[PDB]
Amino acid sequence: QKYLFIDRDGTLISEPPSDFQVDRFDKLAFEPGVIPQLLKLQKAGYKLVMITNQDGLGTQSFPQADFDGPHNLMMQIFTSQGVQFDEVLICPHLPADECDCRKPKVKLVERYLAMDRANSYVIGDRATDIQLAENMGINGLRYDRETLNWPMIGEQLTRR
Amino acid sequence: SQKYLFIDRDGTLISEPDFQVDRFDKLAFEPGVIPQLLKLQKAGYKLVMITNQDGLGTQSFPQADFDGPHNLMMQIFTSQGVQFDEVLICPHLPADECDCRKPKVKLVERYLMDRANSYVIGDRATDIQLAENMGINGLRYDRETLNWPMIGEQLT
Ligand SMILES: [Mg+2]
Ligand SMILES: [Mg+2]
Ligand SMILES: [Mg+2]
Ligand SMILES: [Zn+2]
Ligand SMILES: [Zn+2]
């Protein structure tokens, strides 16, 4: 089974530069082409897993209720349009917590470590996403809106 | 002559709630609308949104309440490559007895187009009547029985 492990903020949707928290609906914005391109990847046989660090989620620094609105709407868009994430894996911890689950640590994905390592990828916009790939023994794709965007990824990962 | 699809908003592109999408938690996309509109654009159809928003811009439905969800809906469509030539809105109450409320044709007079291959797509009898008044085809959108995948297949 080929899997794509996909970061959320800065990858599926834009990342707010002030506080890195999508905690209001007016901060939710989809990255270009993510929907048709994930549908294309699924049609080529990829299954999808979301993985994300949501620093302080569920505490007063990032209330669960504030995260839920935009996140649940985002998920409603994906599901209604046919994009199905097998799991949504969330680390809610602060860096200072020194938790076992914060990417690029692999605790959240340990069950996958099971999959076709040659043809599975992490897709994310940060060096930590690329390090997650290395830690999982799979390939990493560094999402960039201009130079490695959703249409390019859709093409690259279906090349034969 | 250009092929057009005149598409209702509430109950057609997005779910219809008090019949007002005036909160973000009331916004929800209809199944398959994005990939199917993309398929339809590739088949050469141009898209025009047309919607009755009862009492929009009054105390009953402040413009600001409409704007948030609508603009987010537009962000999503646009970011995914779906483009509407125009978004045509009637903001009036039925009791206003205005000139622009579907199925009256005021909003679309400029189009009055390849009529044999143009459609109104909407979920209400009034959308179908709009089609009749415009002299083009009508498709009665129904999430269960005549939905986006079915429309995408039929028109391509
Ligand atoms: Mg990121
Ligand atoms: Mg961070
Ligand atoms: Mg309707
Ligand atoms: Zn953690
Ligand atoms: Zn009117």
Side-chain angles (χ1 to χ4, degrees), chain A residues 10-55:
Chain A
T11 298
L12 298 169
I13 60 177
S14 73
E15 166 190 76
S18 60
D19 54 21
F20 310 97
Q21 296 186 180
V22 188
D23 53 9
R24 295 191 321 254
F25 286 95
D26 77 308
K27 294 165 81 174
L28 175 62
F30 281 74
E31 288 290 320
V34 66
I35 293 181
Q37 299 307 316
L38 291 176
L39 290 171
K40 172 178 173 161
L41 291 158
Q42 284 185 160
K43 282 189 170 192
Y46 287 98
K47 292 185 174 295
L48 314 176
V49 176
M50 196 184 299
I51 185 173
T52 179
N53 293 333
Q54 293 294 322
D55 298 31

Short mmCIF file of all heavy atoms in Angstrom, two decimals, chain A residues 10-55:
data_model
loop_
_atom_site.label_atom_id
_atom_site.label_comp_id
_atom_site.label_asym_id
_atom_site.label_seq_id
_atom_site.Cartn_x
_atom_site.Cartn_y
_atom_site.Cartn_z
N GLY A 10 0.18 25.28 5.91
CA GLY A 10 1.24 25.61 4.95
C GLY A 10 1.35 24.59 3.82
O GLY A 10 2.20 24.73 2.95
N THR A 11 0.48 23.58 3.84
CA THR A 11 0.52 22.47 2.88
C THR A 11 -0.84 22.22 2.24
O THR A 11 -1.00 22.42 1.03
CB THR A 11 1.06 21.20 3.56
OG1 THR A 11 2.41 21.47 3.99
CG2 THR A 11 1.20 20.05 2.57
N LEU A 12 -1.83 21.78 3.04
CA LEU A 12 -3.22 21.68 2.55
C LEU A 12 -3.92 23.05 2.51
O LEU A 12 -4.69 23.35 1.58
CB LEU A 12 -4.04 20.74 3.43
CG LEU A 12 -3.53 19.29 3.45
CD1 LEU A 12 -4.23 18.50 4.55
CD2 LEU A 12 -3.78 18.67 2.07
N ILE A 13 -3.66 23.85 3.54
CA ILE A 13 -4.23 25.19 3.69
C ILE A 13 -3.08 26.14 4.06
O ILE A 13 -2.01 25.68 4.48
CB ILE A 13 -5.30 25.19 4.83
CG1 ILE A 13 -4.66 24.77 6.16
CG2 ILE A 13 -6.47 24.24 4.47
CD1 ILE A 13 -5.61 24.80 7.39
N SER A 14 -3.28 27.44 3.92
CA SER A 14 -2.20 28.38 4.24
C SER A 14 -1.94 28.45 5.76
O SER A 14 -2.82 28.13 6.60
CB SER A 14 -2.47 29.76 3.63
OG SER A 14 -3.50 30.42 4.33
N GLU A 15 -0.73 28.88 6.10
CA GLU A 15 -0.28 28.99 7.48
C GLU A 15 -0.29 30.47 7.88
O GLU A 15 0.40 31.27 7.23
CB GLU A 15 1.17 28.46 7.55
CG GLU A 15 1.91 28.81 8.83
CD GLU A 15 3.39 28.48 8.75
OE1 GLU A 15 4.17 29.23 8.09
OE2 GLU A 15 3.77 27.46 9.35
N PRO A 16 -1.05 30.86 8.90
CA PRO A 16 -1.07 32.26 9.35
C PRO A 16 0.30 32.71 9.89
O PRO A 16 0.82 32.08 10.79
CB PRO A 16 -2.10 32.26 10.49
CG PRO A 16 -2.96 31.02 10.24
CD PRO A 16 -1.98 30.01 9.68
N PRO A 17 0.89 33.77 9.33
CA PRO A 17 2.24 34.15 9.75
C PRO A 17 2.40 34.72 11.16
O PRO A 17 3.52 34.66 11.69
CB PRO A 17 2.69 35.18 8.68
CG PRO A 17 1.38 35.75 8.15
CD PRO A 17 0.40 34.61 8.22
N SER A 18 1.33 35.24 11.77
CA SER A 18 1.48 35.85 13.10
C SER A 18 1.67 34.80 14.20
O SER A 18 2.67 34.83 14.92
CB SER A 18 0.29 36.74 13.44
OG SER A 18 -0.92 36.00 13.44
N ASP A 19 0.72 33.88 14.29
CA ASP A 19 0.65 32.95 15.41
C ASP A 19 0.59 31.48 14.97
O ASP A 19 0.47 30.60 15.83
CB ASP A 19 -0.57 33.28 16.27
CG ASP A 19 -1.87 33.33 15.49
OD1 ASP A 19 -1.94 32.74 14.39
OD2 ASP A 19 -2.89 33.93 15.90
N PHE A 20 0.64 31.24 13.66
CA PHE A 20 0.61 29.87 13.12
C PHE A 20 -0.63 29.06 13.55
O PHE A 20 -0.61 27.82 13.58
CB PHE A 20 1.93 29.14 13.45
CG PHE A 20 3.15 29.95 13.08
CD1 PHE A 20 3.81 30.73 14.04
CD2 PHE A 20 3.57 30.02 11.76
CE1 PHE A 20 4.91 31.52 13.69
CE2 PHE A 20 4.68 30.81 11.39
CZ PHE A 20 5.34 31.56 12.35
N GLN A 21 -1.71 29.76 13.88
CA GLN A 21 -2.95 29.11 14.34
C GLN A 21 -4.10 29.46 13.43
O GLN A 21 -4.41 30.64 13.26
CB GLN A 21 -3.30 29.57 15.79
CG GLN A 21 -2.26 29.13 16.80
CD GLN A 21 -2.62 29.42 18.26
OE1 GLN A 21 -1.83 29.11 19.15
NE2 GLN A 21 -3.77 30.04 18.50
N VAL A 22 -4.72 28.46 12.82
CA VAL A 22 -5.97 28.67 12.10
C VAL A 22 -7.09 28.56 13.14
O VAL A 22 -7.68 27.48 13.33
CB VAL A 22 -6.16 27.67 10.93
CG1 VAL A 22 -7.37 28.05 10.07
CG2 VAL A 22 -4.87 27.60 10.05
N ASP A 23 -7.31 29.66 13.85
CA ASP A 23 -8.26 29.69 14.98
C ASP A 23 -9.47 30.59 14.73
O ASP A 23 -10.24 30.87 15.65
CB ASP A 23 -7.56 30.03 16.31
CG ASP A 23 -6.75 31.30 16.25
OD1 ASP A 23 -6.81 32.06 15.25
OD2 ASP A 23 -6.00 31.62 17.22
N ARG A 24 -9.61 31.04 13.49
CA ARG A 24 -10.78 31.78 13.04
C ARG A 24 -11.09 31.36 11.62
O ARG A 24 -10.18 31.01 10.86
CB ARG A 24 -10.52 33.29 13.03
CG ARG A 24 -10.27 33.95 14.39
CD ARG A 24 -10.27 35.52 14.36
NE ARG A 24 -9.64 36.11 13.18
CZ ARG A 24 -8.45 36.71 13.17
NH1 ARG A 24 -7.72 36.79 14.28
NH2 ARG A 24 -7.97 37.22 12.03
N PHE A 25 -12.36 31.42 11.22
CA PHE A 25 -12.72 31.08 9.85
C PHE A 25 -12.09 31.99 8.81
O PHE A 25 -11.84 31.57 7.69
CB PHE A 25 -14.23 31.08 9.66
CG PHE A 25 -14.91 29.91 10.29
CD1 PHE A 25 -15.46 30.01 11.56
CD2 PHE A 25 -15.00 28.69 9.61
CE1 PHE A 25 -16.10 28.92 12.16
CE2 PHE A 25 -15.64 27.59 10.19
CZ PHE A 25 -16.18 27.70 11.47
N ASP A 26 -11.84 33.25 9.18
CA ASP A 26 -11.21 34.16 8.22
C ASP A 26 -9.70 33.91 8.08
O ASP A 26 -9.01 34.63 7.38
CB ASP A 26 -11.52 35.64 8.56
CG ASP A 26 -10.70 36.16 9.71
OD1 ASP A 26 -10.68 35.52 10.78
OD2 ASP A 26 -10.04 37.21 9.64
N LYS A 27 -9.20 32.86 8.72
CA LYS A 27 -7.81 32.47 8.56
C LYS A 27 -7.67 31.14 7.79
O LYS A 27 -6.56 30.65 7.62
CB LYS A 27 -7.10 32.41 9.92
CG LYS A 27 -6.97 33.79 10.61
CD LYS A 27 -6.61 33.68 12.09
CE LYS A 27 -5.13 33.46 12.29
NZ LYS A 27 -4.69 33.47 13.71
N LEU A 28 -8.80 30.58 7.35
CA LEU A 28 -8.83 29.32 6.60
C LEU A 28 -8.77 29.64 5.11
O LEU A 28 -9.63 30.39 4.61
CB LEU A 28 -10.11 28.52 6.90
CG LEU A 28 -10.31 27.24 6.08
CD1 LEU A 28 -9.19 26.22 6.36
CD2 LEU A 28 -11.70 26.61 6.31
N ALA A 29 -7.76 29.11 4.43
CA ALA A 29 -7.61 29.31 2.99
C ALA A 29 -6.92 28.08 2.40
O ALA A 29 -5.82 27.72 2.81
CB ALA A 29 -6.80 30.58 2.71
N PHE A 30 -7.60 27.44 1.45
CA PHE A 30 -7.05 26.26 0.78
C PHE A 30 -5.90 26.63 -0.15
O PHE A 30 -5.93 27.66 -0.82
CB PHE A 30 -8.15 25.55 -0.01
CG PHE A 30 -9.06 24.69 0.84
CD1 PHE A 30 -10.02 25.27 1.67
CD2 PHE A 30 -8.93 23.30 0.83
CE1 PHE A 30 -10.86 24.48 2.45
CE2 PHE A 30 -9.77 22.50 1.62
CZ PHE A 30 -10.72 23.10 2.43
N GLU A 31 -4.87 25.78 -0.20
CA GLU A 31 -3.79 25.93 -1.17
C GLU A 31 -4.29 25.58 -2.57
O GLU A 31 -5.23 24.77 -2.71
CB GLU A 31 -2.62 25.04 -0.78
CG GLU A 31 -1.86 25.54 0.44
CD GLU A 31 -1.06 26.81 0.18
OE1 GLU A 31 -0.44 26.94 -0.90
OE2 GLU A 31 -1.04 27.67 1.07
N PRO A 32 -3.71 26.18 -3.61
CA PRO A 32 -4.24 25.99 -4.96
C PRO A 32 -4.21 24.53 -5.43
O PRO A 32 -3.19 23.86 -5.28
CB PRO A 32 -3.31 26.85 -5.83
CG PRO A 32 -2.79 27.89 -4.86
CD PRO A 32 -2.54 27.08 -3.60
N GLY A 33 -5.34 24.05 -5.93
CA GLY A 33 -5.42 22.75 -6.60
C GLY A 33 -5.38 21.53 -5.70
O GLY A 33 -5.43 20.42 -6.20
N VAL A 34 -5.34 21.74 -4.38
CA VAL A 34 -5.21 20.61 -3.46
C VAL A 34 -6.33 19.56 -3.65
O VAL A 34 -6.09 18.35 -3.58
CB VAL A 34 -5.10 21.09 -1.97
CG1 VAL A 34 -6.40 21.76 -1.48
CG2 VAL A 34 -4.68 19.95 -1.04
N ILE A 35 -7.55 20.03 -3.90
CA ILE A 35 -8.68 19.09 -4.03
C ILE A 35 -8.58 18.19 -5.29
O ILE A 35 -8.51 16.97 -5.15
CB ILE A 35 -10.05 19.82 -3.87
CG1 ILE A 35 -10.17 20.30 -2.41
CG2 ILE A 35 -11.22 18.88 -4.25
CD1 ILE A 35 -11.46 21.01 -2.07
N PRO A 36 -8.56 18.74 -6.50
CA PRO A 36 -8.42 17.88 -7.68
C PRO A 36 -7.16 17.03 -7.64
O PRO A 36 -7.18 15.88 -8.10
CB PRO A 36 -8.39 18.86 -8.86
CG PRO A 36 -8.14 20.22 -8.26
CD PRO A 36 -8.68 20.17 -6.86
N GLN A 37 -6.07 17.57 -7.10
CA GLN A 37 -4.81 16.82 -7.11
C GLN A 37 -4.83 15.65 -6.13
O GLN A 37 -4.32 14.58 -6.45
CB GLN A 37 -3.59 17.72 -6.93
CG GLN A 37 -3.44 18.76 -8.04
CD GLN A 37 -3.46 18.16 -9.43
OE1 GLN A 37 -2.83 17.13 -9.66
NE2 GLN A 37 -4.19 18.79 -10.36
N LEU A 38 -5.45 15.82 -4.96
CA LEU A 38 -5.61 14.68 -4.05
C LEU A 38 -6.54 13.62 -4.63
O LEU A 38 -6.34 12.43 -4.45
CB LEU A 38 -6.07 15.09 -2.64
CG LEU A 38 -5.02 15.86 -1.82
CD1 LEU A 38 -5.62 16.30 -0.47
CD2 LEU A 38 -3.69 15.08 -1.61
N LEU A 39 -7.56 14.06 -5.36
CA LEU A 39 -8.46 13.12 -6.02
C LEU A 39 -7.70 12.31 -7.08
O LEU A 39 -7.90 11.11 -7.22
CB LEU A 39 -9.65 13.85 -6.64
CG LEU A 39 -10.66 14.44 -5.64
CD1 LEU A 39 -11.66 15.32 -6.39
CD2 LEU A 39 -11.36 13.33 -4.84
N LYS A 40 -6.81 12.99 -7.80
CA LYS A 40 -5.99 12.34 -8.83
C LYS A 40 -5.05 11.31 -8.19
O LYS A 40 -4.88 10.18 -8.70
CB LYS A 40 -5.22 13.43 -9.61
CG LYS A 40 -4.17 12.91 -10.61
CD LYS A 40 -3.52 14.07 -11.34
CE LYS A 40 -2.37 13.59 -12.22
NZ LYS A 40 -1.98 14.58 -13.30
N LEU A 41 -4.46 11.68 -7.06
CA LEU A 41 -3.55 10.78 -6.36
C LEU A 41 -4.27 9.55 -5.82
O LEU A 41 -3.77 8.42 -5.92
CB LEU A 41 -2.79 11.52 -5.25
CG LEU A 41 -1.78 12.54 -5.80
CD1 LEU A 41 -1.43 13.63 -4.77
CD2 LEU A 41 -0.50 11.82 -6.32
N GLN A 42 -5.47 9.77 -5.27
CA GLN A 42 -6.29 8.65 -4.81
C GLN A 42 -6.65 7.71 -5.96
O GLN A 42 -6.60 6.49 -5.80
CB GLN A 42 -7.57 9.17 -4.18
CG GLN A 42 -7.41 9.74 -2.78
CD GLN A 42 -8.75 10.12 -2.17
OE1 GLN A 42 -8.88 10.24 -0.94
NE2 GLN A 42 -9.77 10.32 -3.03
N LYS A 43 -7.00 8.28 -7.12
CA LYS A 43 -7.33 7.45 -8.30
C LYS A 43 -6.16 6.61 -8.78
O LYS A 43 -6.36 5.54 -9.36
CB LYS A 43 -7.89 8.31 -9.44
CG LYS A 43 -9.33 8.70 -9.25
CD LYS A 43 -9.90 9.35 -10.49
CE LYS A 43 -11.43 9.50 -10.38
NZ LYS A 43 -12.05 9.88 -11.69
N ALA A 44 -4.94 7.08 -8.53
CA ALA A 44 -3.71 6.34 -8.85
C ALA A 44 -3.34 5.29 -7.79
O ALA A 44 -2.35 4.55 -7.96
CB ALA A 44 -2.56 7.31 -9.10
N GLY A 45 -4.13 5.22 -6.72
CA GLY A 45 -4.03 4.18 -5.71
C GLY A 45 -3.40 4.62 -4.39
O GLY A 45 -3.15 3.78 -3.53
N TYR A 46 -3.12 5.91 -4.22
CA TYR A 46 -2.55 6.38 -2.95
C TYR A 46 -3.64 6.47 -1.89
O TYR A 46 -4.75 6.91 -2.18
CB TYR A 46 -1.90 7.77 -3.11
CG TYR A 46 -0.59 7.74 -3.87
CD1 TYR A 46 -0.55 8.05 -5.23
CD2 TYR A 46 0.59 7.38 -3.23
CE1 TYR A 46 0.66 8.01 -5.93
CE2 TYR A 46 1.80 7.34 -3.91
CZ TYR A 46 1.82 7.65 -5.26
OH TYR A 46 3.02 7.60 -5.93
N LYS A 47 -3.32 6.06 -0.66
CA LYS A 47 -4.17 6.40 0.49
C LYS A 47 -3.51 7.58 1.22
O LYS A 47 -2.30 7.79 1.10
CB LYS A 47 -4.36 5.20 1.41
CG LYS A 47 -5.18 4.05 0.81
CD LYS A 47 -5.43 2.96 1.86
CE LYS A 47 -6.38 1.86 1.35
NZ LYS A 47 -7.77 2.34 1.08
N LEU A 48 -4.33 8.34 1.95
CA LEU A 48 -3.91 9.61 2.52
C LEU A 48 -4.02 9.60 4.03
O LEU A 48 -5.00 9.11 4.58
CB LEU A 48 -4.78 10.75 1.97
CG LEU A 48 -5.08 10.82 0.46
CD1 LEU A 48 -6.04 11.98 0.18
CD2 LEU A 48 -3.81 10.98 -0.35
N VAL A 49 -3.02 10.19 4.68
CA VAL A 49 -2.99 10.33 6.13
C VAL A 49 -2.57 11.76 6.44
O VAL A 49 -1.56 12.22 5.90
CB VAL A 49 -1.95 9.37 6.78
CG1 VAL A 49 -1.88 9.61 8.30
CG2 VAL A 49 -2.28 7.91 6.47
N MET A 50 -3.30 12.45 7.31
CA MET A 50 -2.91 13.82 7.67
C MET A 50 -2.11 13.76 8.96
O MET A 50 -2.46 13.02 9.87
CB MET A 50 -4.12 14.73 7.83
CG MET A 50 -3.83 16.23 7.82
SD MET A 50 -5.31 17.23 8.14
CE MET A 50 -6.34 16.73 6.76
N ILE A 51 -1.04 14.55 9.02
CA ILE A 51 -0.28 14.63 10.27
C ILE A 51 0.12 16.08 10.56
O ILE A 51 0.61 16.79 9.68
CB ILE A 51 0.93 13.65 10.28
CG1 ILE A 51 1.64 13.68 11.65
CG2 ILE A 51 1.87 13.87 9.08
CD1 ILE A 51 2.73 12.61 11.82
N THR A 52 -0.11 16.52 11.78
CA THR A 52 0.04 17.94 12.08
C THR A 52 0.39 18.20 13.55
O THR A 52 -0.13 17.53 14.44
CB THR A 52 -1.26 18.70 11.68
OG1 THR A 52 -1.12 20.08 12.01
CG2 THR A 52 -2.47 18.25 12.54
N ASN A 53 1.30 19.15 13.78
CA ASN A 53 1.55 19.68 15.13
C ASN A 53 0.68 20.91 15.33
O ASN A 53 0.76 21.88 14.55
CB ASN A 53 3.02 20.12 15.32
CG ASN A 53 4.00 18.96 15.29
OD1 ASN A 53 3.66 17.82 15.62
ND2 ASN A 53 5.25 19.26 14.90
N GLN A 54 -0.19 20.87 16.34
CA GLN A 54 -1.07 22.01 16.63
C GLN A 54 -0.72 22.48 18.04
O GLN A 54 -1.40 22.14 19.01
CB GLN A 54 -2.56 21.62 16.49
CG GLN A 54 -2.98 21.31 15.05
CD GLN A 54 -2.93 22.53 14.14
OE1 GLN A 54 -3.26 23.64 14.56
NE2 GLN A 54 -2.50 22.33 12.89
N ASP A 55 0.38 23.22 18.13
CA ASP A 55 0.98 23.61 19.42
C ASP A 55 -0.04 24.20 20.37
O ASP A 55 -0.65 25.24 20.08
CB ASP A 55 2.10 24.64 19.24
CG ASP A 55 3.26 24.14 18.42
OD1 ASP A 55 3.08 23.30 17.52
OD2 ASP A 55 4.42 24.56 18.60
#
